[PDB]
Amino acid sequence: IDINRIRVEKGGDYQKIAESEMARYKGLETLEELVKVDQKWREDMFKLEQSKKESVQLKKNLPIIEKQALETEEVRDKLWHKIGNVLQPDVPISNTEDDNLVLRTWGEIPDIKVDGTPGKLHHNEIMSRLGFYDSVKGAELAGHRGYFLKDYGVIMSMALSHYAMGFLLKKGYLAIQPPYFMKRDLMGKAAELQDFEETLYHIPSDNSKGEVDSNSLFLIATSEQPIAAMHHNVTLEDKDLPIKYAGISTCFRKEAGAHGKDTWGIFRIHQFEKVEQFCVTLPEDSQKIHEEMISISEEFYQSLELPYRVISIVSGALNDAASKKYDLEAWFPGYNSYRELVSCSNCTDYQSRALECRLKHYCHFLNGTLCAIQRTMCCIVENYQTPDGLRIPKVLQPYMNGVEFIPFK
Ligand SMILES: Nc1ncnc2c1ncn2[C@@H]1O[C@H](COS(=O)(=O)NC(=O)[C@@H](N)CO)[C@@H](O)[C@H]1O
Ligand SMILES: [Mg+2]
Numbered sequence: 001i002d003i004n005r006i007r008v009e010k011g012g013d014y015q016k017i018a019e020s021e022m023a024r025y026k027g028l029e030t031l032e033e034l035v036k037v038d039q040k041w042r043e044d045m046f047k048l049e050q051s052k053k054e055s056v057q058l059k060k061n062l063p064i065i066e067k068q069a070l071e072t073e074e075v076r077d078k079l080w081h082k083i084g085n086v087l088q089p090d091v092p093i094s095n096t097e098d099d100n101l102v103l104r105t106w107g108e109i110p111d112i113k114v115d116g117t118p119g120k121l122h123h124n125e126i127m128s129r130l131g132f133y134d135s136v137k138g139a140e141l142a143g144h145r146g147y148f149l150k151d152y153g154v155i156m157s158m159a160l161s162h163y164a165m166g167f168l169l170k171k172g173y174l175a176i177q178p179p180y181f182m183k184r185d186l187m188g189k190a191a192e193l194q195d196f197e198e199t200l201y202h203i204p205s206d207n208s209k210g211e212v213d214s215n216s217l218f219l220i221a222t223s224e225q226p227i228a229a230m231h232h233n234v235t236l237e238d239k240d241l242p243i244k245y246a247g248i249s250t251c252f253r254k255e256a257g258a259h260g261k262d263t264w265g266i267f268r269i270h271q272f273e274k275v276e277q278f279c280v281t282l283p284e285d286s287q288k289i290h291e292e293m294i295s296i297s298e299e300f301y302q303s304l305e306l307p308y309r310v311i312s313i314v315s316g317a318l319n320d321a322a323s324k325k326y327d328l329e330a331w332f333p334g335y336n337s338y339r340e341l342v343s344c345s346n347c348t349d350y351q352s353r354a355l356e357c358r359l360k361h362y363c364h365f366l367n368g369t370l371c372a373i374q375r376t377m378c379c380i381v382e383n384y385q386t387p388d389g390l391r392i393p394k395v396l397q398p399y400m401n402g403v404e405f406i407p408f409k
Pocket of ligand 2: 327340342343
């Protein structure tokens with residue numbers, strides 16, 4: 001009796017998905033269909049268990065049950081990807097970003113009142129007056145948002161990368177530079193569906209008529225994607241992990257949904273560098289490591305003396321993989337606001353189950369920005385500006401051969 005009535009256990013999982021999907025403001029539409037296909041998959045699986053282990057020529061009904069079950073097994077698995085990860089209980093339940101929960105704030109806001117004068121400028125106005133970047137000729141060669149890095153733009157970019165990578169290595173992180181493009185089947189298991197339409201550049205195979213074949217390549221939007229897919233069909237023991245990765249790479253993003261938004265300077269671009277945190281933990285250690293990864297990012301920007309605030313993103317705005325995401329918004333005197341510099345998410349076993357990173361039980365994947373070089377430079381520039389030039393943060397001065405100040409060209 002209770003054996004068949006164990007459907008309470010299966011119905012209890014559908015309840016947790018329903019509560020999370022409602023908090024994501026997804027309307028529980030894809031969920032109601034997944035419940036029906038799951039039963040029909042259980043109906044087809046029970047028929048496929050017709051072992052026939054003992055003059056019946058039923059050997060023709062066996063291929064009919066196998067292929068028909070796979071036709072519904074792929075339809076059922078295609079829906080389990082559209083369902084978002086179950087949110088954690090302390091996630092703000094709201095559909096607008098104006099309800100993002102501010103957790104803590106560090107640093108006093110500077111006295112710069114951006115008005116277009118040399119004493120208070122926007123990041124693009126300072127960097128263009130310092131010969132940092134070239135967007136006129138960069139857009140001529142690569143289209144909108146294209147740019148060159150020049151002079152101390154390259155020097156500060158290299159200095160900030162060394163200080164960022166060294167920051168994680170001193171905390172026991174493992175340095176890693178991944179491939180900058182991935183194949184279709186691997187990228188599909190690491191990136192959301194919206195990433196393909198909005199973000200990922202597509203390099204199709206020759207003579208494929210531009211279609212997405214199995215040999216299609218996609219440039220990485222972050223080192224999170226190749227480092228996550230790096231654990232494909234990998235089993236790890238409790239003695240092997242936790243693993244902390246210090247990823248560094250260039251990032252390619254189409255920004256197709258950010259049309260017209262932030263097009264001056266190098267705040268939002270198609271190509272940028274980023275030093276990344278990626279951690280593989282036990283399910284028990286996931287929440288403890290998530291708070292560690294965000295405090296490491298807090299510590300990094302405290303040493304840059306950039307005021308910031310750490311907020312928790314609302315439920316209706318999260319990606320499908322995040323069970324909870326923390327954002328570090330640093331102070332930009334130009335925009336007179338806090339602007340996003342670091343995202344730190346606890347994805348639990350969303351991608352690891354897709355990638356079959358077994359421990360059925362799976363590992364928990366977490367990712368977090370440490371420093372997006374190009375955008376952090378925009379924040380450094382707006383805070384360390386003077387009417388006579390740019391000041392260099394003390395932590396970066398050793399990496400720049402000792403320079404303390406840069407005058408306007
Ligand atoms: N188009 C862009 N141009 C410049 N910097 C960007 C761009 N897109 C994102 N960034 C920077 O990169 C950070 C991380 O981007 S994210 O997609 O939000 N998060 C990730 O990629 C995670 N893997 C954590 O790093 C952002 O907070 C921002 O500082
Ligand atoms: Mg983000």
